[PDB]
Design a binder for this molecule. Structure first.
Ligand SMILES: CC(=O)N[C@H]1[C@H](O[C@@H]2[C@H](O[C@]3(C(=O)O)C[C@H](O)[C@@H](NC(C)=O)[C@H]([C@H](O)[C@H](O)CO)O3)[C@@H](O)[C@H](O[C@H]3[C@H](O)[C@@H](O)[C@H](O)O[C@@H]3CO)O[C@@H]2CO)O[C@H](CO)[C@H](O)[C@@H]1O[C@@H]1O[C@H](CO)[C@H](O)[C@H](O[C@]2(C(=O)O)C[C@H](O)[C@@H](NC(C)=O)[C@H]([C@H](O)[C@H](O)CO)O2)[C@H]1O
Length: 425
């Protein structure tokens, strides 16, 4: 990790012993109230409950306001989807999530529907705001209810917002005077919110430098790294959990067992079809309900694990298999009940070929016996009937995944979508 990053951390809020602590080395006081849900993946949840609050008292014995002339804030956030019957309140109602104010001066992070807002107030009461807005009209959003990485950088001249390491917003703040930035930091939802409103956050940090684009991309990569695969939302991928399947190479496509058949046909997602012309999305809770089974201390799926890919068909667990008789470059997968056959492969190795941050994984068929032989990767392909798109195994992907840079648009890139309280359709 670049010393430009490490040498300049003045607040580093991290999970420790069923608590959040400052690990910067400056010793800020952190009070987590009983309404904050914490987990050992460093995620914390702010709710509408009066006791859902974190109070951080910066160490004013060591931390001087002059340190915040150039400064940056980074965190990950997961902001739930609008309620389809609540779109007006979503669009209009601004709520604070993090507030650092002394005598009406300081900095604030707030949300209004689909925008995240950075506000600076100087000691004269002169305010300037910069914001990031993500679309609520995309077929498939990178942002709605999914973990993403925010970095805000400030110097005398500019306030910038980066999202997943890329610049999204930039305002001139030359006219903004002295900002008191060393006060108490309050993590708490504050505004005209529904009872059901919540925000997830992770890895909240403050740096007493203006982080470079280079520095921000490095933090994004380091904080993205895991030994475990992730789901579509960015949470750890789990065994024994029901998941819809998403194809990162054909985002509007889903798998359905073809009626009375043993193959998965690829169909096009339905779309939001109610009144509001403010919103558009493709349905996520569609197609077969899959479940990942261990082939042989936690239920987390790790890179290189051996798995069965199963799904529920008419009240019974079925399995995804690949025919051993496989002369062509691609072949439809065989969907059937759970049984052993010398005629098919059942064992999948779950892979991450991508070097760059991603929630996609890849699914490699192997022989039952612990062998280095690679059969093929699960993907999509058009087969002669006109041509029709099917759930397939492909030898073609074996060479494509070895190409640099890794192509995230390959049809062998899958994500697993569990039902989530932050996504109601
Ligand atoms: C386009 C095509 O049909 N590709 C299939 C390929 O067909 C061979 C010839 O195609 C090329 C090619 O890949 O483009 C032509 C190049 O010139 C070749 N390059 C060389 C030699 O350097 C290249 C290579 O030879 C091979 O790739 C091997 O490495 O092949 C194609 O032109 C030719 O077409 C014939 C046709 O078959 C005949 O019917 C017709 O009469 O004549 C034409 C012209 O001759 O056929 C060639 C083989 O006979 O063959 C490979 C198998 O080797 C694949 O089938 C390939 O198609 C790809 O298959 C995989 C599954 O294995 C997927 O289905 C790919 O689709 C996806 C995916 O990755 O899953 C779907 C995704 O939705 C999509 N993402 C998007 C749109 O966001 C991705 C994405 O487009 C690509 O991954 C690239 O980013 O594709 C499917 O493309």
């Amino acid at each position: 990790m670049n010393s430009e990053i490490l040498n300049n951390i003045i607040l580093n809020l991290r999970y420790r012993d069923n608590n959040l602590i400052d690990l910067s080395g400056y010793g800020a006081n952190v009070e987590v109230y009983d309404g904050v849900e914490l987990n050992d993946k460093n995620q914390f949840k702010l709710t509408s409950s009066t006791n859902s609050e974190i109070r951080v008292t910066q160490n004013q014995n060591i931390i001087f306001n002059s340190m915040f002339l150039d400064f940056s804030v980074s965190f990950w956030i997961r902001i739930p989807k609008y309620k389809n019957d609540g779109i007006q309140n979503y669009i209009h109602n601004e709520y604070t999530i993090i507030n650092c104010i002394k005598n009406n001066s300081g900095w604030k992070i707030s949300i209004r529907g689909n925008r995240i807002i950075w506000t600076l107030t100087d000691i004269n009461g002169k305010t300037k705001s910069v914001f990031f807005e993500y679309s609520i009209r995309e077929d498939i959003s990178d942002y709605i209810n999914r973990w993403f990485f925010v970095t805000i950088t400030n110097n005398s001249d500019n306030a910038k917002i980066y999202i997943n390491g890329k610049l999204e917003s930039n305002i001139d703040i030359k006219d903004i005077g002295e900002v008191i930035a060393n006060g108490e930091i309050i993590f708490k939802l504050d505004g005209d919110i529904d009872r059901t409103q919540f925000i997830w956050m992770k890895y909240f940090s403050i740096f007493n430098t203006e982080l470079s684009q280079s520095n921000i991309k490095e933090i994004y990569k380091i904080q993205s790294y895991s030994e475990y695969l992730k789901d579509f939302w960015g949470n750890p991928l789990m065994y024994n959990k029901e998941y819809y399947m998403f194809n990162a190479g054909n985002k509007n496509s889903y798998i359905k067992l073809k009626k009375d058949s043993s193959v998965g046909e690829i169909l096009t997602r339905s779309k939001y079809n109610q009144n509001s012309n403010y919103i558009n999305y493709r349905n996520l809770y569609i197609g077969e309900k899959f479940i990942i089974r261990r082939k042989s201390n936690d239920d987390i799926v790790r890179k290189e694990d051996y798995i069965y890919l199963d799904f529920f068909n008419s009240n019974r667990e079925w399995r995804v298999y690949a025919y051993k008789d496989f002369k062509e470059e691609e072949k439809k997968l065989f969907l059937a009940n759970i049984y052993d056959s010398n005629e098919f492969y059942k064992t999948i190795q779950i892979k991450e070929y991508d070097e760059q941050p991603t929630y996609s994984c890849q699914l490699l068929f192997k022989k039952d016996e612990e062998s280095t032989d690679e059969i093929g990767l699960i993907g999509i392909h058009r087969f002669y009937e006109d041509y029709k798109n099917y759930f397939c195994i492909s030898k073609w992907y074996l060479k494509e995944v070895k190409r640099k840079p890794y192509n995230p648009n390959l049809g062998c890139n899958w994500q697993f979508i569990p039902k989530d309280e932050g996504w109601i359709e």
